[PDB]
Amino acid sequence: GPGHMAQVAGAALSQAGWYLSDEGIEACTSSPDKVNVNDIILIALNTDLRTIGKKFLPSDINSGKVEKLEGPCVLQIQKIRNAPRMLRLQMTDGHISCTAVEFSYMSKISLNTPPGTKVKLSGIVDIKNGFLLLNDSNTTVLGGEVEHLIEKW
């Protein structure tokens, strides 16, 4: 019934790398009697993690003191700046901001990639002087957009 269905949906979300708060998951669920992980994910893709996400990044991730970050985990792109292409990404878990550099041959992130886009990081990601080092091996674009995204609330 609704209790066990919410439980198995919550398990599926965590297994996929999402870190949403309990209140966030309720917000993304259209009814306690119509729990559908696809629809929870669709709404979350198109929602600001500052509103629905749970903290999972280390507070000092930009300090240099953190050297690695293990996936799976879903992050949100706040801003993008521009042989493979190289982009600089400002990202957030909804609580802590971090910065990445991304090298992509297959070109699935561009400077046109909308703010609010979600990406999933997989495996162990190196962080070199505060920059996460991303490439096509450890980064998957999940999509979504957060319209009219404001970087600083």
Author numbering: -3 to 78, 91 to 161
Q: Which passages does the manuscript contain on this structure?
A:
The N-terminal DUF1767 domain of TDRD3 is composed of four α-helices, followed by the β-barrel structure of the OB-fold domain. The DUF1767 structures of TDRD3 and RMI1 are topologically similar but differ in size and orientation relative to the OB-fold domain. The OB-fold domain of TDRD3 contains an insertion loop between β2 and β3 (Val79–Pro92), which is 23 residues shorter than that of RMI1 (Val95–Ser132). Concomitantly, the C-terminal region of the TDRD3 OB-fold domain is not folded into an α-helix, contrary to the secondary structure prediction by PSIPRED. Limited digestion with chymotrypsin cleaved the C-terminus of TDRD3 OB-fold at Trp161, which is positioned in the middle of the predicted α-helix. This result suggests that the C-terminal region of the TDRD3 OB-fold domain is unfolded in solution, consistent with the present structure. The insertion loop of TDRD3 is completely disordered in the apo TDRD3 and becomes ordered upon binding to TOP3β with some flexibility, as judged from high temperature factors. Comparison among the two apo TDRD3 structures in the asymmetric unit and the TOP3β-bound TDRD3 structure exhibited two different conformations around the N- and C-terminal ends of β3 and β4, respectively. β3 and β4 in one of the two apo TDRD3 molecules and the TOP3β-bound TDRD3 are one residue shorter than those in the other apo TDRD3 molecule. The Arg93-mediated hydrogen bonds stabilize the shorter β3 and β4, which might be appropriate for binding to TOP3β. We found a positively charged area that could be considered as the potential DNA/RNA-binding site in DUF–OB of TDRD3.
Topoisomerase III (TOP3) is a member of the type IA topoisomerase family, which functions mainly in relaxing the supercoiled DNA and in resolving recombination intermediates during meiosis and DNA repair. TOP3β is an atypical topoisomerase that can recognize both DNA and RNA as the substrates12132223242526. Eukaryotic TOP3α and β are unique in that they interact with their specific auxiliary factors, RMI1 and TDRD3, respectively, and coexist with them in the cell. We determined the crystal structures of human TOP3β TOPO domain, TDRD3 DUF1767 and OB domains (DUF–OB) and their complex at 3.44 Å, 1.62 Å and 3.6 Å resolutions, respectively.
